[PDB]
Amino acid sequence: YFQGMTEYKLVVVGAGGVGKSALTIQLIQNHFVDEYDPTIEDSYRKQVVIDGETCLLDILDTAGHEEYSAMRDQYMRTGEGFLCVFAINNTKSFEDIHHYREQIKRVKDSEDVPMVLVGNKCDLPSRTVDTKQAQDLARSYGIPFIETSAKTRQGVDDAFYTLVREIRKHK
Ligand SMILES: Nc1nc2c(ncn2[C@@H]2O[C@H](COP(=O)(O)OP(=O)(O)NP(=O)(O)O)[C@@H](O)[C@H]2O)c(=O)[nH]1
Ligand SMILES: COc1cccc(-c2ccc(Nc3ccc(C[NH+](C)C)cc3)c(OC)c2F)c1
Ligand SMILES: [Mg+2]
């Protein structure tokens, strides 16, 4: 019996400065943050309609700048889907994607975890990671790829809605 809308727990991960907070704030508040305020841990919530189902997104915005924590491994255990964010103007953040995915596969103890690869800052000219390289990486993991800009709002909704669609396929 129906007790309230379905709830989805999403975690946004990736290197420091790629725009994990900017994406989330752009989703919740329709606001671009220009200042860079390093995050330890922040939680958000938004109601949306995706494919005709109303649902509640519980979103955890993580830190990039983290050494081993057991607080960290706890939220990777509870979270049902992951946005893996890199910045298209920072090749190191792209190479770090592999580390985030391994860390997740290890704690969930599973090959098949709902994920979306997100290449942020596609508004900047400084592109050092090619769209094709990222699509290939995503195809090799069997997951979707979305190019976003927290500044222009391109792909922001799509990134979160796509993740929810992946979580739905998984069950
Ligand atoms: N041009 C442009 N700048 C962006 C974009 N996304 C974020 N930024 C900028 O990049 C900086 C870092 O954004 P922020 O959201 O703090 O990154 P983060 O991944 O949350 N950082 P942290 O991991 O330390 O919490 C900020 O100045 C922000 O304005 C984007 O899509 N385009
Ligand atoms: C521990 O791991 C995760 C992984 C992914 C998501 C959440 C999560 C993230 C957010 C909320 N809930 C929440 C979010 C924002 C507020 C803000 N407040 C001012 C209304 C309150 C509750 C939540 O509650 C059940 C959450 F569970 C937790
Ligand atoms: Mg952040």
Author numbering: -3 to 167
Provide excerpts from the study.
The RAS family of oncogenic proteins is important as therapy targets because of the frequency of activating mutations in almost all major cancers. All family members function by signal transduction to the nucleus of cells via interaction with effectors (such as RAF, RALGDS, and PI3K) that catalyze phosphorylation of downstream proteins. When KRAS is bound to GDP, the protein is in the inactive state and becomes activated by nucleotide exchange from GDP to GTP. Mutant RAS proteins remain in the active state and hydrolyze GTP at a much slower rate than wild-type (WT) RAS.
We used these analyses to design of cross-over compounds linking the common diphenyl-anchoring moiety of PPIN-1 and PPIN-2 to the Abd-7 aniline fragment. All three compounds showed very similar binding modes to Abd-7 with van der Waals contacts to K5, L6, V7, S39, Y40, R41, D54, I55, L56, G70, Y71, T74, and G75. Ch-1 was found in four of the six KRAS169Q61H chains (A, B, C, and F); Ch-2 was again found in three of the six chains (A, B, and C) and Ch-3 was found in four of the six chains (A, B, C, and D). Thus, by combining the anchor constituent of the PPIN compounds with the aniline fragment of Abd-7, we generated a compound series showing good electron density for the entire molecule when bound to KRAS pocket 1. Each of these PPIs was inhibited by the Ch-3 compound in a dose–response assay. Furthermore, the BRET interaction signal between KRASG12D and either PI3K (α or γ) or RALGDS was inhibited by Ch-3, demonstrating that the BRET data are not restricted to KRAS-CRAF interaction. The most potent compound appears to be Ch-3, which invokes an almost complete reduction of phospho-AKT at a concentration of 10 μM while not affecting AKT protein levels. The potency of the two of the cross-over compounds (Ch-1 and Ch-3) is improved, relative to Abd-7, as these show IC50 at 72 h of 5.3 and 4.5 μM, respectively.
